[PDB]
Amino acid sequence: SLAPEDGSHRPAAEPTPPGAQPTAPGSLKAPDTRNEKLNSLEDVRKGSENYALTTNQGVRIADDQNSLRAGSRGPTLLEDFILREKITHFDHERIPERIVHARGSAAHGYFQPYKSLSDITKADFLSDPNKITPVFVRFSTVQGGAGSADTVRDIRGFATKFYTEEGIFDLVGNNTPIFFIQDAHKFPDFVHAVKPEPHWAIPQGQDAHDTFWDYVSLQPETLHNVMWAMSDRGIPRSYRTMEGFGIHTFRLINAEGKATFVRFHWKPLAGKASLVWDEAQKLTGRDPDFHRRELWEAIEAGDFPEYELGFQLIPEEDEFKFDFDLLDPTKLIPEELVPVQRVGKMVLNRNPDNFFAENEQAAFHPGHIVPGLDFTNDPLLQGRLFSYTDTQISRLGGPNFHEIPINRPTCPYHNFQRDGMHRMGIDTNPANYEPNSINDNWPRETPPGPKRGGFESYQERVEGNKVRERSPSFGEYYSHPRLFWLSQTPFEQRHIVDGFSFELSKVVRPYIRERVVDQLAHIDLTLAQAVAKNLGIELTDDQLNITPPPDVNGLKKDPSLSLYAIPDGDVKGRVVAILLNDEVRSADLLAILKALKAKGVHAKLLYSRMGEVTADDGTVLPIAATFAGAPSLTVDAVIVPCGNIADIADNGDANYYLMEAYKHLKPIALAGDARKFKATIKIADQGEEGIVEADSADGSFMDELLTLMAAHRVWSRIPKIDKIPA
Amino acid sequence: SLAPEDGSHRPAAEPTPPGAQPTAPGSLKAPDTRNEKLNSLEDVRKGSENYALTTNQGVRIADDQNSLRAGSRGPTLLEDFILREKITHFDHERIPERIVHARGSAAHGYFQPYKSLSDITKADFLSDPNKITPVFVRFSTVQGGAGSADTVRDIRGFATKFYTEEGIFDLVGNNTPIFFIQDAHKFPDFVHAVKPEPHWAIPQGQDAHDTFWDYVSLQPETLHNVMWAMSDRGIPRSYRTMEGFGIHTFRLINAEGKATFVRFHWKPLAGKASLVWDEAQKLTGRDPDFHRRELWEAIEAGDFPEYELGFQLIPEEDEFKFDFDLLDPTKLIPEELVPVQRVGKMVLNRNPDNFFAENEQAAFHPGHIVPGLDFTNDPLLQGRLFSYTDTQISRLGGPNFHEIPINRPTCPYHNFQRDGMHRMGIDTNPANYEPNSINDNWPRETPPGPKRGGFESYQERVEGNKVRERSPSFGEYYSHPRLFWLSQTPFEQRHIVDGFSFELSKVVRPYIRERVVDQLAHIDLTLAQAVAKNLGIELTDDQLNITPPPDVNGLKKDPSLSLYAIPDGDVKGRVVAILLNDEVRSADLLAILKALKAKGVHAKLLYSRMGEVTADDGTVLPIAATFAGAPSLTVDAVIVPCGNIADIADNGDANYYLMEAYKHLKPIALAGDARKFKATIKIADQGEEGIVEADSADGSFMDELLTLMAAHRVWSRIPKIDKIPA
Amino acid sequence: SLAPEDGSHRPAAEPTPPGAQPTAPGSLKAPDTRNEKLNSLEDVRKGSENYALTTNQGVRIADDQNSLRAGSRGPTLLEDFILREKITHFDHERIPERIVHARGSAAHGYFQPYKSLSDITKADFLSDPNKITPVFVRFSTVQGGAGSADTVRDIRGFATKFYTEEGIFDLVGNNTPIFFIQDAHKFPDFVHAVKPEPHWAIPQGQDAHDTFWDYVSLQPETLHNVMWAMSDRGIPRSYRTMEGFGIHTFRLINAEGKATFVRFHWKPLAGKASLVWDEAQKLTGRDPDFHRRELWEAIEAGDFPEYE
Amino acid sequence: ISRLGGPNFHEIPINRPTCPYHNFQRDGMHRMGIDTNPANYEPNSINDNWPRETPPGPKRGGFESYQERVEGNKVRERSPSFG
Numbered sequence A, B: 001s002l003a004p005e006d007g008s009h010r011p012a013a014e015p016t017p018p019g020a021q022p023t024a025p026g027s028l029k030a031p032d033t034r035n036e037k038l039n040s041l042e043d044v045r046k047g048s049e050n051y052a053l054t055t056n057q058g059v060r061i062a063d064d065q066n067s068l069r070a071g072s073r074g075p076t077l078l079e080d081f082i083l084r085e086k087i088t089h090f091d092h093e094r095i096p097e098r099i100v101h102a103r104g105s106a107a108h109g110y111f112q113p114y115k116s117l118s119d120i121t122k123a124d125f126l127s128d129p130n131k132i133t134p135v136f137v138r139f140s141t142v143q144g145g146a147g148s149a150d151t152v153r154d155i156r157g158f159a160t161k162f163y164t165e166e167g168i169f170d171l172v173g174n175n176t177p178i179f180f181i182q183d184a185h186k187f188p189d190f191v192h193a194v195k196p197e198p199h200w201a202i203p204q205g206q207d208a209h210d211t212f213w214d215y216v217s218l219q220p221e222t223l224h225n226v227m228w229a230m231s232d233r234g235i236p237r238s239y240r241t242m243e244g245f246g247i248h249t250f251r252l253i254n255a256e257g258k259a260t261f262v263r264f265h266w267k268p269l270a271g272k273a274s275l276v277w278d279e280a281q282k283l284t285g286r287d288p289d290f291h292r293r294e295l296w297e298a299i300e301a302g303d304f305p306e307y308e309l310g311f312q313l314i315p316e317e318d319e320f321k322f323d324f325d326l327l328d329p330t331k332l333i334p335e336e337l338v339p340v341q342r343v344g345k346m347v348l349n350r351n352p353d354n355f356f357a358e359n360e361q362a363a364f365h366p367g368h369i370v371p372g373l374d375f376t377n378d379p380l381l382q383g384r385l386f387s388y389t390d391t392q393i394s395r396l397g398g399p400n401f402h403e404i405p406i407n408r409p410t411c412p413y414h415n416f417q418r419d420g421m422h423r424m425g426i427d428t429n430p431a432n433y434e435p436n437s438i439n440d441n442w443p444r445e446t447p448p449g450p451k452r453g454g455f456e457s458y459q460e461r462v463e464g465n466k467v468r469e470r471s472p473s474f475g476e477y478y479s480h481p482r483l484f485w486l487s488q489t490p491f492e493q494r495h496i497v498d499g500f501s502f503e504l505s506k507v508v509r510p511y512i513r514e515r516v517v518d519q520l521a522h523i524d525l526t527l528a529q530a531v532a533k534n535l536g537i538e539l540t541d542d543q544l545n546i547t548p549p550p551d552v553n554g555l556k557k558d559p560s561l562s563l564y565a566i567p568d569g570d571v572k573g574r575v576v577a578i579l580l581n582d583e584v585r586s587a588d589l590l591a592i593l594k595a596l597k598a599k600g601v602h603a604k605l606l607y608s609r610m611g612e613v614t615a616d617d618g619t620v621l622p623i624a625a626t627f628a629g630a631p632s633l634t635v636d637a638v639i640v641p642c643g644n645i646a647d648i649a650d651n652g653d654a655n656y657y658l659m660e661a662y663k664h665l666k667p668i669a670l671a672g673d674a675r676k677f678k679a680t681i682k683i684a685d686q687g688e689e690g691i692v693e694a695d696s697a698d699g700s701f702m703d704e705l706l707t708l709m710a711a712h713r714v715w716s717r718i719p720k721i722d723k724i725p726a
Numbered sequence C: 001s002l003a004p005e006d007g008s009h010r011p012a013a014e015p016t017p018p019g020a021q022p023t024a025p026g027s028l029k030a031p032d033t034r035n036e037k038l039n040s041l042e043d044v045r046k047g048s049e050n051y052a053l054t055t056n057q058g059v060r061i062a063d064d065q066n067s068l069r070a071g072s073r074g075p076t077l078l079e080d081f082i083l084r085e086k087i088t089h090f091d092h093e094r095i096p097e098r099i100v101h102a103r104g105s106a107a108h109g110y111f112q113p114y115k116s117l118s119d120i121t122k123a124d125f126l127s128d129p130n131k132i133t134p135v136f137v138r139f140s141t142v143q144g145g146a147g148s149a150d151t152v153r154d155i156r157g158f159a160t161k162f163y164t165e166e167g168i169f170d171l172v173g174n175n176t177p178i179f180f181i182q183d184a185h186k187f188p189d190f191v192h193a194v195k196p197e198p199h200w201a202i203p204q205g206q207d208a209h210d211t212f213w214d215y216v217s218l219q220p221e222t223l224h225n226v227m228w229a230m231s232d233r234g235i236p237r238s239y240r241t242m243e244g245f246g247i248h249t250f251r252l253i254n255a256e257g258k259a260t261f262v263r264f265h266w267k268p269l270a271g272k273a274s275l276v277w278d279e280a281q282k283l284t285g286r287d288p289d290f291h292r293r294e295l296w297e298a299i300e301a302g303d304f305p306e307y308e
Numbered sequence D: 001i002s003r004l005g006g007p008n009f010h011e012i013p014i015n016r017p018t019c020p021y022h023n024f025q026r027d028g029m030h031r032m033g034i035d036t037n038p039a040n041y042e043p044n045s046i047n048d049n050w051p052r053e054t055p056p057g058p059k060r061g062g063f064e065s066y067q068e069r070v071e072g073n074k075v076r077e078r079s080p081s082f083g
């Protein structure tokens, strides 16, 4: 018995806030959170407590500390089969990572529609507001390996496996509404250009290098998603605070056989929020697991990630009514033209038990659809359909990857397919072919119908010659980038310009930077000029004279394309650093902590060392982390309570904490003599918007602080931060 | 509905004789035959009746006859995910075959001891006669591929997986009591020498080629097993009628820690029986699946394969009491010196459901032992311990092959090993290492003990220098071959000579044949001379003068080494061909079938066409096969009833049936006018031992036939067969 | 032609200081730098300039920008074998990373002894001061994945393959002179304890978590190498400025059959130097490829890494 | 991909073309060819876009599919002419 006698090794099996208890496998942390998929995994869940340690063949091991040798200082013997089994399993633990989105974090949850959608689709999982469908969702970055950092600038994946009663449906989306390229034949080129360069394998998790911008400069179709990635969309605060999109136009098919075109959306109920670049980049060093950690801890705290599924629906007869082609995945459908109709809610409420078994081995593929859905001729979607089945043959070791437990349907599956590596199902059917008489032709085909019918493809008319040709309706590259640019606030536009400027500064061949700037001048001259000024490049008179691309269907902006133009803040689940001193005003700390708790905001008590400090009144304050150990990068706001401020006033870490939080536009609140830190951040005596200050933490101090947190960051501080040495 | 109205598509779920019903998966043929392992496989058995045909993701298929195309004569579309999943699974069905023993046939059963062995071993499965241990047994040839023929001349494997309460123990043996080589380092040399030659990959399932005999001629340690392989041991009648051996000396360890040396035996309760070479060779062309078929149908009929497990036990103090080294796997322990103690019985009573999932994927390995067993320094066994865990990583795809259902232990298994390709178990342990505090160190090591204890190696003393050197005690090659030769009946010696003669005649390089005859002259001059005579080789005076090797501990024979010297014939499960005519004497047929039924012998009614014939009293006799369709090779004896003999008397195929059966030494019985067929096989009017003839098929006629069948073949016939052109 | 007319896309094939030119494949940056191993790879090196783009079966491709479809807005056809070959190869690019030391940076070079060692060893590569042996060296971290950062706190691997005339010798060492554990049977326990924890797969490239310190606390044999890892040895400035060690005692065997015990060392001729923790940790965010980059650029500059 | 272990099966010697082959495909299990191209994508400027596409033509040209006419709905249907 090596556990502490007080039982403190084991986290409580109840919701607890971030940092309050060690994290644990979901079935131990939250044994009563169930759904039909979680329950179906019980056949493979393995416990440990009270069991003997064995080999994989069930033989009990007596001494798991030593190899078998001839003499206690002698050579290891070949006959040690316990050693060799254990080292062999170790030696073959790794499987190939995903070719793209190798870095990702996943959770289980459930989805339910708000009302039946039978009028527009026969998909069973959308047929009844009381039908609950379990989900497994993985969120990811794109470029970096499985061991890369989370808060890089990149697109994010947002992949949802719906375990429906009529089959698995995987909605395999990203967090921006378009992709970089038009036709899947170019996917290896694009991916190779953004991935680490092939001679030296640098850089990891960064588009900031020559080959990515070379390809962008040569393929202007890429510019629209490049605009999104260079905005603060590329650096989300959390997977809970980003949008999701299926990108492609798909079809819904109802029981009468009518097709409606659809694009899929996820709206985050926590709101949209992103980091700023300097914070994101520094956070990749201070905590490369920050998004993975934040998702796991939100679920352990009960701050369940919630998202609303929504559809943009366009009738078949309106296919050609826009200035862009609906089948072109580099174009978005502005919500001002086609609104998102709310469909249902997804809540992620339990972590996995074992990351490798459930996250690493999960296989999502957008070809996994169900009756009631269908594809379109989008030429990027069409090639995706080939890739996601083919890649699993190496990644997951063969054609039986649907028998890996996380991938299994919860509905029935029966067919004539047999064998393959790793075959788990032992088929008893006398027949392995159809048509057969020897088993009365079972299992049997099922005609299509309104419910529980076979899959039949929508009978779309095809007419044309066999060509490798891009549709001319796809040959427009700048109007969507411009619509995105004009829809952003002034501070978002600044962050875009700073994104392009920072990334192009890392491109060693200057002509590439020049070619990118020339493309920017086809989108918007103000953008192009601002980036050029940061790169020391002067636009030519020709460039100054490029006419801007047209409006998109009459629109000159669409505010739903901005993260921040329309307030959607939610403070629940956010966190505040509280910088302690060795004699904290206890009345301040009571008021601060209860106000935060009332709004579901978490706190971390920080000091210059671990252990405890004692408040003016004798209250013992346990310390969560030191100032350097939990930097301001990891919090949303900073509060400094009154007390003995001299204890920390000359602490360089405490001062720099406030300087970093101030640079990154975070709300900062200072009570009583903590206002002596105004000099560290150069705040005027009469104060400034974004800094809460008062004689004590009472009255409206915490409400003012919370109001600032609901607006996420103090954008008005931006011109004040250039001078700050931080 | 495609099944026939009358239900004749589905075999009865009751025991039935070979040929009476179509064969079926074991759980459908014998649903009520149960054991703990078969019951534990219920989680992975999948049915089929009444279920819809789906993709592997659970989506119902409407049309499983057509690809999706643009127009009904148009090109196939990439978006056809149904067709690609089905073709992808097909394209990846095969896995590598086993390096050796790739051809094999398997069944489920159970083992039970006759008495507790706790005085000599603490192995839990041998602790109590009421301990029932499920087994899965795979019988195999050695050289040929998984698609090669069964009745080749070869060594046979006999591998038994015991699913004990203290771990899987695999007894991985062959059907002769020694192996070809002494040290595992030479196994790839020997196996490459016997396998198809590397330039052109010929010959399949045959040792009859230059490289095999080149290795043998240069490595006289092989000669003992080569003598077995050249005897009729090399061509068993059935997996049910051969012996099995573990070959190596292992140890039993009791609760006191005392080690006893043990060699393992399986004694077939159906008796020992083999084919003759011509019959075996021709059977590889008429039915290359004969042993697989015979095993499956025996079990379907309730002719369960039964074997007694036997131990030769040698106390530790007697290690050096023999003329040969107990660790040398090319030496046998004569039963006259150390008797086989009969310790328990194994019954194989259920065929698999799916060959690939349960037989092809089964992994047996002799390093899978349990507490109460241990290894010795036998240098062939020592190297085997490395190979059987290593080879599964490619064959079965990775280190989780114990999770493939058929391989899973039925007792608990818990450890800190994680991940690997197609990981099924989802571990919930917070710890994946020990020692750990965070899960109170579970699962925990267990000290060795008398029951349910951890495995500890027997503390054998090792003293010597690090050397690659063969023990001098292994350097004797001829005395065991000679003891084997002297123990055979005269007809068994003739078949040995004929085996050597036929094989060496296929060696194209004559000096190799000469070098083999020289080795034979070191074993026995009579043998050497008889082989040389058939090869047109004359022994030199030096060869005529080689002194024979010494007796083995005073023995100049041991009849336990002969298949036939001691009567152990059992006719239950054997099969007779009854050659019909278009007017059968029904009284003969009743008397024949009655007497066969009484002894559990099966029959097959044969004619010149399929369909039925009608007997003299009107009984309608259904025909199982034609003369040419079910050759005499496939039966144990032939009976010709009386009736309209002129119907068949000039039938070449019916005459040849009897000539072939007669050449192969099979009993033949002829009733009434069927005695006209005496002329085709040249039998004198007075008759001949092994031909049963009488006026009708009365009761005496059948006892005489059944007595011949209990003696298997009519060996006295051998000098008459030289004249038969068949 | 997409290249700039001034030729500024292509780096000079001469030694240049870090940042002066874009980095390039070895054989194009330093075509005249050769050794027996580098030459022997010429059978499989493949160029590109002036060659047509083809499938892997050697069929020239006319249009590498589009899939084949039925009409220019139509569905992609299964008979597009060019698209499926290209996407199949992409789909199967990745292989499993190394179980440990998955993050590493490598280079070619050569070794030669200062004098013959025939009195203590008959190894051919140590027999003659003028017999040069090619080498390939990979330096690595231990815990993190292939896409983790370079300037973590960790032990570093230092593995040298010597391509000798009497076979390959691999000296597979680390940058500290001992290991954490005594018996290989415990390696999966120790590695599992230091690797990301199994429920949530955190933390990457860091021993700073409960399971590693749990194992340490319960296995005091670890403490020596834990001391080295917590010192600035854990955060070297460059792979050029750390020591290497084989850790184990091995044997040298001379022609007379005498055995001498030996432990192997590499001394960096650039000297020993490490970062400080705040700088190392912030560098994993500002340039997670810092040691990979510094090694490649030192070789491009002519600052060849040398070790005794 | 299973039978020959991955996507570099054209590098097994019997399968290799005797004519030139050059493209932007990289890596995979058992990769033999060591690409020196600074670029592993096209279009690129950093290797002047080599290796380059080739127009179709009478000899030594790029592959182009015959522009057969396709007309019909997306169906899983046997042509009646096959019946």
Ligand code: HDD
Pocket: A098, A099, A100, A101, A104, A138, A139, A140, A156, A157, A158, A159, A172, A173, A174, A178, A179, A183, A184, A187, A246, A247, A248, A329, A362, A363, A364, A380, A383, A384, A387, A388, A389, A391, A392, C087, C091
């Ligand atoms: C033709 C190839 C191709 C194209 C054009 C795309 N992808 Fe993809 N994608 C892959 C081929 C691929 C892949 C090779 O099949 C991956 C990696 C491994 C896997 O299982 O699938 C994958 C993974 C992958 C994942 C991670 C799934 C997971 O968590 O396991 C997401 C979220 C996306 N992709 C999303 C997209 C979106 C939104 C695209 C454009 C609209 C896109 N993919 C285009």
Ligand code: HDD
Pocket: B098, B099, B100, B101, B104, B138, B139, B140, B156, B157, B158, B159, B172, B173, B174, B178, B179, B183, B184, B187, B246, B247, B248, B329, B362, B363, B364, B380, B383, B384, B387, B388, B391, B392
């Ligand atoms: C050092 C290597 C080596 C040596 C010396 C032997 N074998 Fe072996 N044997 C193998 C390496 C191997 C193997 C490569 O590991 C096989 C092939 C596939 C498998 O799973 O194991 C195997 C399969 C195999 C099987 C088939 C098991 C099955 O049905 O799947 C049997 C019955 C034997 N062997 C029996 C023997 C006997 C009785 C030996 C000598 C006394 C012997 N083997 C020596």
Ligand code: HDD
Pocket: A087, A091, C098, C099, C100, C101, C104, C138, C139, C140, C156, C157, C158, C159, C172, C173, C174, C178, C179, C183, C184, C187, C246, C247, C248
């Ligand atoms: C019993 C298992 C075992 C143990 C006890 C060790 N290693 Fe190891 N090592 C491995 C099992 C391993 C491995 C699983 O075999 C690796 C990863 C995959 C590979 O090719 O080798 C490996 C890789 C590996 C590499 C990377 C080689 C490369 O760059 O590819 C280095 C430098 C070391 N190890 C160094 C050590 C040192 C100095 C050890 C202690 C003195 C040590 N290893 C103990």
